[PDB]
């Protein structure tokens, strides 16, 4: 009867086209502002002093870029970790010079993605679902907050944060290799196993369902039209695909249970990306990966090279060349 | 010893945020009755509007 | 300096295959409106 109850009834209605919910009250204003500023800053945005040395790095399309090289540049080294909104900038020209829109996009992104995650919970509550799709979405939220939030914190500047682009991503990955040795760190190892394993069990499960489909169509029409939507009959012989994989490797390595099978597809990647995103986090605070340089010696004591020493000389090439003007002192403490 | 404390209590403090997500998803749904799954006799989606 | 044959590569790489996929949809809906026998078959 009241105005608030007629508003709570609408905002929590599943009869809307897109469910809004109470998290959409701060998902939609956040992500539309992260979007509408991203499209403008990617297309039309002046160059940005990223190294704090007043050498402005172009990143937008109107200043001679493309899809690959164009990128929303991170904020300055001069700012660093300080909060830099528009009203604390004394003009928009001073805001866009010092890496303004990187903080406006990222902070409205991480609020909107952490609200998109809670929105996946909310609709599962109002639909009668068991709730935990949003726990599986915690794994890219852990990884998005690792390269945009946690790594600028432990390194003390948003300038070490990830550039919102495509070539800026590979500037981020290579400089992160030289300074932290991520490939030898066992948490990037535990998530390469998460996505190689994840793409394995995806294409391994998706093939054994498509292999054992039941005849419901003719050879002229499509294979997919043998599934009517909302039917109650099972659309594939699960005993058939169990007997196949029960002979392809051996018998006891096969899940006859389809529920425990469809749980292992959700376990393996998500655990692999939780562990990986806490690799960037523990390497944000300079707890680097393994270092086996000069580890094998002869009885005389001369250093015998290994593959890690060849990997070290690739890291030394990126270390002596990243931010080639920003350094003045012999050790990259930042 | 700073890098051991900032990388281990930080390490745990994300997984306990995941513990807030697991244990409250179950507890809110155990209070409502559907933590064991959807009822076959009464599905809530079928008693809704057309989908659009 | 960009290659001036790339405009012909991209804008025909967009339009020619994308206008192809539109045609397979329009004749799909015409066959469905063709069999249905009401007001649109002719």
């Amino acid at each position: 009867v009241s105005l608030w109850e007629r508003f709570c009834a609408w905002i929590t209605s599943t009869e809307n086209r897109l469910y809004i919910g109470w998290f959409g009250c701060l998902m939609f204003p956040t992500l539309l502002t992260a979007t509408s500023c991203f499209i403008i800053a990617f297309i039309a945005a002046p160059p940005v002093d990223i190294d704090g040395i007043r050498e402005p790095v172009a990143g937008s399309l109107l200043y001679g870029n493309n899809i690959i090289s164009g990128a929303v540049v991170p904020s300055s080294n001069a700012i660093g970790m300080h909060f830099y909104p528009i009203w604390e900038a004394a003009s928009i020209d001073e805001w866009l010079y010092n890496g303004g829109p990187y903080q406006l996009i990222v902070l409205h992104f991480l609020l909107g993605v952490s609200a998109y995650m809670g929105r996946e919970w909310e609709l599962s509550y109002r639909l009668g679902m068991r709730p935990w799709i949003f726990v599986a979405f915690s794994a890219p939220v852990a990884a998005a907050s690792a390269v945009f939030l946690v790594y600028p914190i432990g390194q003390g500047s948003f300038s070490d944060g990830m550039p919102l682009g495509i070539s800026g991503t590979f500037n981020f990955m290579l400089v992160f290799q030289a300074e932290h040795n991520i490939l030898m760190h066992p948490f990037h190892m535990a998530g390469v196993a998460g996505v190689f394993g994840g793409s394995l069990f995806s294409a391994m499960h998706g093939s054994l369902v498509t292999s054992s489909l039941i005849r419901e169509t003719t050879e002229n029409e499509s294979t997919n039209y043998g599934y009517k939507f909302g039917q109650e009959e099972e659309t594939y012989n699960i005993v058939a695909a169990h007997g196949y994989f029960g002979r392809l490797i051996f018998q006891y390595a096969s899940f006859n249970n389809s529920r425990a099978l469809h749980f292992f597809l959700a376990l393996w990647p998500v655990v692999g990306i939780w562990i990986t995103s806490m690799g960037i986090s523990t390497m944000a605070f300079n707890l680097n990966g393994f270092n086996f340089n000069q580890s094998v010696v002869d009885s005389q004591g001369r250093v015998i090279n290994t593959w890690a020493d060849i990997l070290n000389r690739a890291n030394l090439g990126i270390e002596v060349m990243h931010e080639r003007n920003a350094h003045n002192f012999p050790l990259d403490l930042a | 010893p700073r890098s051991w404390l900032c990388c281990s209590h930080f390490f745990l403090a994300f997984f306990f945020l995941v513990g807030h997500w697991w244990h409250s998803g179950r507890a809110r749904a155990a209070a409502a009755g559907f933590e064991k799954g959807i009822n076959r006799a009464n599905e809530p989606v079928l008693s809704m509007r057309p989908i659009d | 300096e960009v290659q001036f044959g790339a405009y012909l590569a991209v804008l025909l790489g967009t339009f020619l295959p994308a206008l192809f996929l539109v045609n397979l949809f329009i004749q799909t809906e015409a066959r469905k409106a063709g069999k249905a026998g009401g007001q649109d078959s002719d």
Partner: peptide, 30 residues
């Protein structure tokens, strides 16, 4: 002149995302 093509590809991609969400073929039981 060159960046005009890149912008048209980007907003043209966001058009077909708009039509796929709102003008989707709504699936129906029976």
């Amino acid at each position: 002149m060159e960046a005009l093509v890149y912008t048209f590809l980007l907003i043209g991609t966001l058009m077909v995302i708009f039509f796929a969400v709102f003008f989707r073929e709504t699936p129906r039981i029976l």
